[PDB]
Amino acid sequence: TTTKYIFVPIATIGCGKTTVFNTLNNLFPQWTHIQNDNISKKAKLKICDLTLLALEDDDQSVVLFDRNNSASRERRQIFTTIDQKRDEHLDDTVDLKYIAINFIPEDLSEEELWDITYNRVIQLDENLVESVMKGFIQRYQPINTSRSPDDQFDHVIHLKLSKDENSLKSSLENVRIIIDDLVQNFPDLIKEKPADELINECFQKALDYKPTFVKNMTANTIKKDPTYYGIAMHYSSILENLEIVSHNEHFQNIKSHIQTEFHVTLGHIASSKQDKAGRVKWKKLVKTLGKGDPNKPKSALKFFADVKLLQIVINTDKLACIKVEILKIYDTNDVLQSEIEPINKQLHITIGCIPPATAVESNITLEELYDNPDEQELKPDGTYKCGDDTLHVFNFDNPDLKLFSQQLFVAYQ
Numbered sequence: 533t534t535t536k537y538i539f540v541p542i543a544t545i546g547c548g549k550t551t552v553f554n555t556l557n558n559l560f561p562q563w564t565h566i567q568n569d570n571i572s573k574k575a576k577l578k579i580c581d582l583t584l585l586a587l588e589d590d591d592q593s594v595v596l597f598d599r600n601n602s603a604s605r606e607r608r609q610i611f612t613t614i615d616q617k618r619d620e621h622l623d624d625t626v627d628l629k630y631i632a633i634n635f636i637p638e639d640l641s642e643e644e645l646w647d648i649t650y651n652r653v654i655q656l657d658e659n660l661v662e663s664v665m666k667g668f669i670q671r672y673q674p675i676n677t678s679r680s681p682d683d684q685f686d687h688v689i690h691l692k693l694s695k696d697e698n699s700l701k702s703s704l705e706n707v708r709i710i711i712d713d714l715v716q717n718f719p720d721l722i723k724e725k726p727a728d729e730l731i732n733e734c735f736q737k738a739l740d741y742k743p744t745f746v747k748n749m750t751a752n753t754i755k756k757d758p759t760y761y762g763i764a765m766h767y768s769s770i771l772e773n774l775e776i777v778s779h780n781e782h783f784q785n786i787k788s789h790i791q792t793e794f795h796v797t798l799g800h801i802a803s804s805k806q807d808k809a810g811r812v813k814w815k816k817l818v819k820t821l822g823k824g825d826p827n828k829p830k831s832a833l834k835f836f837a838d839v840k841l842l843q844i845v846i847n848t849d850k851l852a853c854i855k856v857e858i859l860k861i862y863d864t865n866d867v868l869q870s871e872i873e874p875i876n877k878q879l880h881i882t883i884g885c886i887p888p889a890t891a892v893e894s895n896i897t898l899e900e901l902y903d904n905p906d907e908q909e910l911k912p913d914g915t916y917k918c919g920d921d922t923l924h925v926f927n928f929d930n931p932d933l934k935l936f937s938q939q940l941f942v943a944y945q
């Protein structure tokens with residue numbers, strides 16, 4: 533009855549796995565070539581799943597299982613995974629021969645292995661390729677058919693690997709080795725050997741196809757986005773305007789947690805994730821105010837703001853903050869920048885927090901105080917119960933607490 537085949541490389545990167553498998557598939561289009569490099573790291577159906585799917589139909593007899601399997605545990609994973617899922621995909625009467633294709637001769641030096649493969653991969657990335665490649669060689673364990681797991685292979689084909697600038701290419705010799713092996717040992721797979729002209733042509737095609745790299749080597753950069761955009765507030769100017777609450781009994785808790793810098797937050801990356809509104813406003817902030825130098829926790833930007841201090845709100849035993857308004861934002865030549873829209877409704881300067889609570893809670897404090905969209909006027913002095921918080925409101929006597937030319941900054945935390 534029916535026999536199916538899984539061809540399993542034992543290899544490191546650049547040994548010619550994909551070239552050899554692409555040559556064979558060019559000659560035998562009914563075979564299925566599954567490339568682990570082209571499977572998402574987060575794919576629900578991984579190579580063992582796709583291998584079994586590609587063996588279900590009768591006409592599908594061969595999978596070229598294109599993965600390094602450098603470590604002995606990775607060969608064990610093939611057997612145990614396919615053992616467990618096989619009965620969902622194949623009749624009980626089927627084998628399932630596993631043919632190991634050994635790409636690294638047992639007497640190849642580690643330094644010649646590196647010299648052959650590293651230089652093949654070169655010839656738009658420089659040394660990301662060295663650490664990913666050395667990782668596969670680090671954990672490479674040669675085939676050992678005298679013990680598990682490699683003693684579970686039904687057959688082993690031993691390939692050549694060498695510098696070949698003056699000889700037949702080693703992957704073409706290897707295609708010939710595989711074909712001759714199959715013709716002698718599995719005539720049902722290859723009835724008659726294809727013509728050498730055809731084998732050579734198919735190999736040339738495969739030798740010139742766009743290469744495929746493991747995804748950690750084609751791993752793109754994270755064009756990192758900053759954590760938040762702020763207005764740096766002149767320290768002594770904020771401190772001097774705390775005198776309105778300095779003697780208040782509900783502020784004495786807060787005094788020992790007063791911050792050593794004050795800022796108005798314009799936008800935090802976390803808010804790009806609540807609304808479409810929060811996303812769009814975050815993007816426009818990154819567009820207008822650029823990504824400053826990213827190897828510094830704070831970078832000043834060439835924009836400045838005028839800010840008016842409106843009232844102090846104490847969230848009892850939690851924090852104190854100043855509700856503010858931004859009068860204007862402008863650049864170094866004082867032209868107004870109308871396109872800078874803050875994300876937070878309820879703009880504020882956090883003063884200090886009692887350390888169960890954190891500065892992010894200044895927003896919830898002012899939002900719960902000003903929760904009615906049709907009543908946003910400054911509330912008069914006094915105590916306000918909001919949810920489970922007791923708030924105290926202190927309006928400034930001076931209607932003209934304007935702070936000018938406060939410089940914007942970007943923050944990466």
Ligand SMILES: Nc1nc2c(ncn2[C@@H]2O[C@H](COP(=O)(O)OP(=O)(O)O)[C@@H](O)[C@H]2O)c(=O)[nH]1
Nearest residue numbers: 545546547548549550551652701702703704739
């Ligand atoms: N010199 C030489 N280069 C080869 C040979 N076979 C493949 N290559 C090249 O080596 C690079 C890596 O081959 P590839 O098949 O992708 O290796 P893989 O990482 O094991 O899949 C590619 O540029 C191939 O064109 C060969 O026999 N000799």
Ligand SMILES: [Mg+2]
Nearest residue numbers: 549550569744
């Ligand atoms: Mg490959």
